[PDB]
């Protein structure tokens, strides 16, 4: 028998969790402090993951999210919602993709939950499912109030590939629109 | 000022090919590891996973740099950063719309151009199926696993709704890998 | 057959993390399912560390700890304690190293908190600071009841260098002894 | 100059992060790249450190362009040294790492018993990270040694300053005297 060794390489910044790194870079370009905290497992199979973004105007001494103090979560995967939402502060805001995420009924009492079909928006209204991270980014910014929206949009546009700037501007504006109109469940 | 704490949860194209391949080999009764990599940079940048497969025990659960048999790449920077670990004369499949090797590379490796993103987006009608196009290409080029065994295993792994598109993706990967010629 | 979720937190070179790995390997060796979930952040320096271990006698559908469902935490660094204890279930068990971790008074009502001077036990009683991971391992296994102790000990001893078995056995035994005597604050 | 350094062990990882933080503190760019695999147990460890005085546009080591490697575990040496540029520097712990003889022609390989130096001469095996740090910084030429020592010394617990300063100075001395195999 032979030992086989195979290498697979792809492009960055494609999933919804890409929203986080853009947001953190945006905060740092403003002169604020930000960390991006990540997680991984010993699992072979791919599965849901998560990125936590921590932003402050003063030194951040703890470069991870404090469980129970998270202000806002956006989730497009049911198991990721169910596994990680327990760290969101009571009365915190959670945006979920209703085509994919199905909270237990009691959750609607603990958190303010909004349904926004981010993936459909990206795929059908923007015309490119890969803009889903920017739809998500705009929604996160608008709901959390963590950063100026015009400041964020500008930074995002300098960060993404030139080829995608048209579509990502539209995706951002649609994210803001949807979050502006969204009502808690 | 306030401290803000935000959580994003989701999910990966070509990476996903590697995971499917490793799980399929383990399901045959072989050994396999998936080795991954990450950075302290705020932006994540290009991605890479290495898949190691053997019938016997694998004592080192990472790729041996200089011994990689096969690489598939859809990102220019990832190609340029990582191909150096591929053995001399090893097989590299690149997406010609996105990856542009320096001319000297064609003398060190056997490089094949397959437009995987276009095949998945246009012929299959679903850009997410690039995972399975890449998987079929990897298996065909590397001979690391029986194509029928892998296709059947993949079919059990994917949701019924996506099965037709994934089977079409797999078949197109094999066709393109079969027809592909190395760049001189 | 229950699903067990354990959280280990340290900093830098505290082998607290190593406890998690041995434990997961031991469960797998028994024929059970186990995942290790790890974390990292966007800086070059190692800071607080956290490893989550998930063990079941059936398929684990989510390879991360479920925030709010963690059964047990062992913590040897104050920042990691304060940052990650929020995911421990109410009434759940937490062991802290009292020379390094300083919970707010309200925490003692929410969780059962035990103080065990892990670093000093390894340093002074075992005479080898690097055995703290084995002290920690025995405490966690005992407190969570996630694995039989006789089986775990044997597995651990085959996992370590032949000439450290005497010290590691003793470390293990002291972990159990201290866990057995400990009372919640 | 862009510097790319690889640290491999099972101690040595910490050397890489101190180096990177010192580079950042002096006003340069630095990233740490890390790797994991699909098992619960920790095995061989490797961290890449990339330093430059301009924007780094790829946050990993470039395989084939690594300037320098320090290795204290055989498996990680055999698995990861292939990414080191031809004629690059590799330092190995000769009590633990055993290169195939053809390696001595491709790379400049120096033998330094880092683990003994920390355990025996400094009297604290944990300071092997600072021994390794000094060797890597000398061998790679990537930073001013005085600045690095002063930054490292601010970074460690005050009670350990004496041990670490000695570990550093020993690192530099053994790297200076070392000859390629």
Beta strands in A46-87 (DSSP E): 49-56, 70-75
Chains in touch with A (≥3 Cβ pairs < 8 A) = B, C, D
Q: How far is CA D136 from CA A18, A75, B128, D63, D118, in A?
A: 35, 43, 44, 19, 15
D81/B65 CB distance under 8 A:
yes
Residues of chain C positioned with their CB less than 8 A from the CB of B38: 40
Going by C-alpha positions, the residue among C137, C29, D58 that lies closest to residue B78 is: D58
CA distance C64 to A49: 9
Residue pairs between chains C and D whose CB atoms are closer than 8 Å: 35
D40/C44 CB distance under 8 A:
no
CA distance B113 to B72: 10
- Name the DSSP letter for residue D180: B
CATH number belonging to domain B1-184:
3.40.920.10
In terms of CA atoms, which chain C residue is nearest residue A87? C67
In terms of CA atoms, which chain A residue is nearest residue C69? A86
The β-bridge partners of C35 are C54
CA distance B68 to A5: 5
B70/A6 CB distance under 8 A:
yes
Q: How far is CA B67 from CA A122, B89, B110, D84, D95, in A?
A: 41, 10, 14, 14, 26
**Residue C51: which region, alpha, beta or left (left: phi > 0; alpha: psi -120 to 50)?**
beta
Going by C-alpha positions, the residue among C42, C51, C105, C106 that lies closest to residue C75 is: C51
C42/B38 CB distance under 8 A:
no
Q: Which ranges of A65-131 does DSSP label H, i.e. alpha helix?
A: 78-84, 107-110, 118-120
Element (H, E) at C18: helix C16-29
CA distance B15 to B36: 10
CATH number belonging to domain D1-181:
3.40.920.10
Tokens of D26: 């002096």
Go through chain B and tell me how many residues it has: 184
Other C-beta atoms closer than 10 Å to the C-beta of A2 total 11
Residue pairs between chains B and C whose CB atoms are closer than 8 Å: 8
In terms of CA atoms, which chain A residue is nearest residue B65? A5
CA distance D82 to B50: 15
B41 lies within 8 A of chain C by CB: yes
Q: Are D153 and D165 in contact (CB under 8 A)?
A: yes
D87 lies within 8 A of chain B by CB: no
Separation in Å, CA of B40 to nearest CA in chain C: 4
CA distance A50 to A73: 10
Tokens of D81: 């040294």
In CATH, the architecture of A1-185 is 3-Layer(aba) Sandwich (3.40)
The residue extents of the domains of chain D are 1-181
Q: Are B65 and D80 in contact (CB under 8 A)?
A: yes
CA distance D76 to C27: 26
Counting Cα atoms < 13 Å in the Cβ hemisphere of C104 gives 8
CA distance B11 to A13: 12
- What determination technique applies here? X-ray
Nearest-CB residue to C41 (from A35, A83, A84): A35
Beta strands in chain C (DSSP E): 4-11, 33-41, 48-56, 70-75, 88-96, 112-115
Q: Which residues contact D105 (CB under 8 A, 6 or more apart)?
A: none
- Name the DSSP letter for residue D157: -
A161 lies within 8 A of chain D by CB: no
Tokens of B84: 């150096």
Q: Are C165 and C131 in contact (CB under 8 A)?
A: no
Residues of chain C positioned with their CB less than 8 A from the CB of A77: none
Which is it for strands B31-39 and B47-54: parallel, antiparallel or unpaired? antiparallel
Residues of chain A positioned with their CB less than 8 A from the CB of C51: none
A6/B142 CB distance under 8 A:
yes
DSSP B93-152: EE-TTT----TTHHHHSEEEE--HHHIIIIIIS-GGGHHHHHHHHHHHHH--S-HHHHHH
Angle between helices C149-159 and C16-29 (to 10 degrees): 110
What are the contacts of C111-119 at 24+ separation with CB within 8 A?
C111/C85, C112/C184, C113/C184, C113/C185, C114/C143, C114/C179, C114/C182, C114/C183, C114/C184, C114/C185, C115/C182, C115/C185, C116/C178, C116/C179, C116/C182, C118/C16, C118/C74, C118/C76, C119/C14, C119/C76
The β-bridge partners of C50 are C9
CA distance C67 to C50: 14
Separation in Å, CA of B39 to nearest CA in chain C: 8
Q: Tell me the three-class secondary structure of C142-157, residue by residue.
A: HHHCCCCHHHHHHHHH
Q: In what order do the strands lie in the sheet with C88-96?
A: A112-115, A88-96, A70-75, B4-10, A49-56, A33-41, C33-41, C48-56, C4-11, C70-75, C88-96, C112-115
The β-bridge partners of D148 are none
A42/C35 CB distance under 8 A:
yes
Q: Which residue has the tokens 């919640």?
A: C184
């Amino acid at each position: 028998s032979l030992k086989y060794q195979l290498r697979f390489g792809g492009e960055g910044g494609q999933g919804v969790i890409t929203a986080g790194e853009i947001l953190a870079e945006a905060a740092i370009k403003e002169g604020r402090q930000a960390f991006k905290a990540s997680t991984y497992t010993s699992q072979v199979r791919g599965g849901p993951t998560k990125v936590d973004i921590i932003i402050d105007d003063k030194e951040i001494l703890f470069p991870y999210a404090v469980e129970g103090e998270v202000d806002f979560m956006l989730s497009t995967a049911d198991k990721g919602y169910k596994g990680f939402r327990g760290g969101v502060k009571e009365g915190g805001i959670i945006v979920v993709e209703p085509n994919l995420v199905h909270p237990e009924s009691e959750d609607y009492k603990k958190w303010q939950i909004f349904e926004i079909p981010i993936i459909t928006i990206a795929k059908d209204e923007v015309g490119n499912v890969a803009t889903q991270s920017v739809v998500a980014l705009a929604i996160a910014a608008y709901m959390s109030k963590c950063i100026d929206l015009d400041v964020l949009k500008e930074t995002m546009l300098h960060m993404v590939p030139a080829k995608t700037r048209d579509a990502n501007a539209k995706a951002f504006d649609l994210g803001v629109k949807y979050a502006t109109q969204a009502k808690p469940h």
